[PDB]
Amino acid sequence: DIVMTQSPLSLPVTPGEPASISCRSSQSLLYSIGYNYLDWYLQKSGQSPQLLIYLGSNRASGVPDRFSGSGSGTDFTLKISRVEAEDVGFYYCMQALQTPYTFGQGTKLEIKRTVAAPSVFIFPPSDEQLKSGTASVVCLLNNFYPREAKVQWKVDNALQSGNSQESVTEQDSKDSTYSLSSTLTLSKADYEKHKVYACEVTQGTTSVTKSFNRGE
Amino acid sequence: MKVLQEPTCVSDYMSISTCEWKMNGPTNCSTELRLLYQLVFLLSEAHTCIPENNGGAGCVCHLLMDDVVSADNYTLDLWAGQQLLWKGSFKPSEHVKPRAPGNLTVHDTLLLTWSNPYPPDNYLYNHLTYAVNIPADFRIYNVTYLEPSLRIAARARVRAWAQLYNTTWSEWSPSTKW
Amino acid sequence: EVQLVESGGGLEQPGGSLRLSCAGSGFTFRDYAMTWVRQAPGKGLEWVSSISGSGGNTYYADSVKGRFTISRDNSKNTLYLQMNSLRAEDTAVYYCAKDRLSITIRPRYYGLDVWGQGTTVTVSSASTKGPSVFPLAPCSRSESTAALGCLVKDYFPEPVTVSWNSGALTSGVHTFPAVLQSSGLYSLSSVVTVPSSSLGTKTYTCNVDHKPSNTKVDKRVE
Ligand SMILES: *[C@@H]1O[C@H](CO)[C@@H](O[C@@H]2O[C@H](CO)[C@@H](O)[C@H](O)[C@H]2NC(C)=O)[C@H](O)[C@H]1NC(C)=O
Ligand SMILES: *[C@@H]1O[C@H](CO)[C@@H](O[C@@H]2O[C@H](CO)[C@@H](O)[C@H](O)[C@H]2NC(C)=O)[C@H](O)[C@H]1NC(C)=O
Ligand SMILES: *[C@@H]1O[C@H](CO)[C@@H](O)[C@H](O)[C@H]1NC(C)=O
């Protein structure tokens, strides 16, 4: 089958700047003159893939003038004239000449925007949860850049370790920030034993610490 | 029932492609035979052509072409009821009989105009060379530029040749009297 | 508009069978070829199967040859992948797509221009557990912008789809990717941000769907 080689894997850029993705097939995808069978797709994580470009350089209905296809035979290029916050996601090329339809590895497009502090919010476990004997405490960091951050849980000044998991969203399409949640898991036993719960968000030269008291 | 002379095809390189075959013993092609065909390309569909009679033993099929480019190649299958008689393939671009030129008009100067029957996006658009005949005895004029005209001072019909190998002459056009 | 809607995904056993489905509206189903694409978690796209608009020709990826079966009903405007004798690496999210117009002598292809929403197949020996949904509310001591949410804990398999006020509230929503807890279940949170002002007037519901257990949970949050 036709091997597609997509390049680069990683594409950091800056909003308003131009951007480029190459694609090299292991054979010619031209059938007749004007008819190369190479397609471009974007996938925003959580969403279904969507066509940008069909047959080398034809724009899909929905696709702005900013996105341009180019190339012939075995050499294809997708141009973005000025990048924007909603261009974030994963870019794929696909040959559609011979089965099996094959895909390039994929490009992660990532926006370099300016630094942002998270809004930090702490959440206690629901009364409803404590019946089932598990107490979950959730810290949330809202709309920050960059993805790098140190979250540390403290239980009455005691630095808990290896009883918490985290998750980050993809880069937001509107404001290019990230959001991160951190989840602490306790036995109901533990949650009664202690009072003051806090999560420390550490970024650069800043350490925000939101807290609550099981009492109030 | 047997195939005496295997299918042979000739396209006009745009819309029609005539395939003919002869048989051992007389056939009613219109009833007994069915020729299915499919452009050898991903996710295409086979289609059906109900033939007609060229004498007793001979059949003819006008296959519809969605235009033709050089790369095209079709798989031909001849059935009688549910019996396969013959398996084959053909490239239409490979045996060409050009379409006839069109509206032959007249106009110091004597200008003759005609229509190139193929549209701009077709290969034969700019690969046709024209022959012009000029009652009693005549005289020919080979036009070999892209413009479909002719000029001079002091029957009259036009035909067409194509820059190909297995090619022939077009039918003559409607004719005018100067 | 022109839509494709998928169904028939859940948890099946290694060695089991499953049948996928693709309802399609807004055109002549029969005129068009259709394609199945699959995406393993983390990994990229992978073409699975394709079929002409007549039913005439089928095309199968090697690693599924003989096992999976492509089929269509052009009166009911529906397309099926008949997954048989499943292995562990059949675990992926499955999409269908409008491929090439095939009625005509020459196919016309304008890309995979319409996509289905996806449906998940998990091939495992553990048992399917519907979700637990607890609210996420601040500890009150009486801020300009408030942060609400729902936590969705202890479910198997994936996926879960989260909504807010039956789709009516989109702004400020962040639904987090699911993590695997070491017990072998999935946890996920979903948070929103609202003005302090509209807290007394407006009401705030989150809509959790877990098709693999046929469970649907609604939590009004306070
Ligand atoms: C081939 O067979 C068909 C069908 O028998 C012939 O066409 C018709 O024949 C019937 C009698 O079977 C006539 O009464 C019809 O009026 C005919 N219809 C038409 C539209 O002609 C056909 O003539 C046969 N052809 C040959 C060459 O033998
Ligand atoms: C046109 O397409 C047909 C496909 O049907 C080709 O015929 C095959 O050619 C290969 C050559 O490697 C042989 O192995 C097969 O026996 C043929 N199969 C069938 C079903 O016909 C043909 O090569 C193509 N080319 C031309 C010039 O017509
Ligand atoms: C003419 O016909 C023969 C059929 O066998 C073929 O080999 C030849 O190459 C044809 N024409 C062209 C232009 O290739």
Numbering used by the authors:
A (entry chain B): 1 to 216
B (entry chain C): 1 to 107, 112 to 138, 144 to 163, 173 to 196
C (entry chain A): 1 to 142, 145 to 224
What does the report in the manuscript say about this coordinate set?
Alignment of a human Fab structure onto a rabbit Fab showed that the longer FG loop present in human Kappa constant domains forms a bent and bulging conformation that would interfere with a beta sheet packing interaction.
The modified FG loop of the Cκ domain (“Crystallizable Kappa” or more simply “Crystal Kappa”) also enabled crystallization of Fab:antigen complexes. Crystals from the initial screens diffracted to 5Å in the case of the former and not at all for the later. While the heavy chain CDR3 and light chain CDR1 were disordered in the parental Fab structure, the CDRs in the Dupilumab complex are ordered and substantially the same conformation as observed in the Crystal Kappa versions of the Fabs. So we were surprised that in every crystal form of every Fab and Fab complex (including a dozen more not reported here) we saw only HC to LC constant domain packing (in two cases, no beta sheet packing).
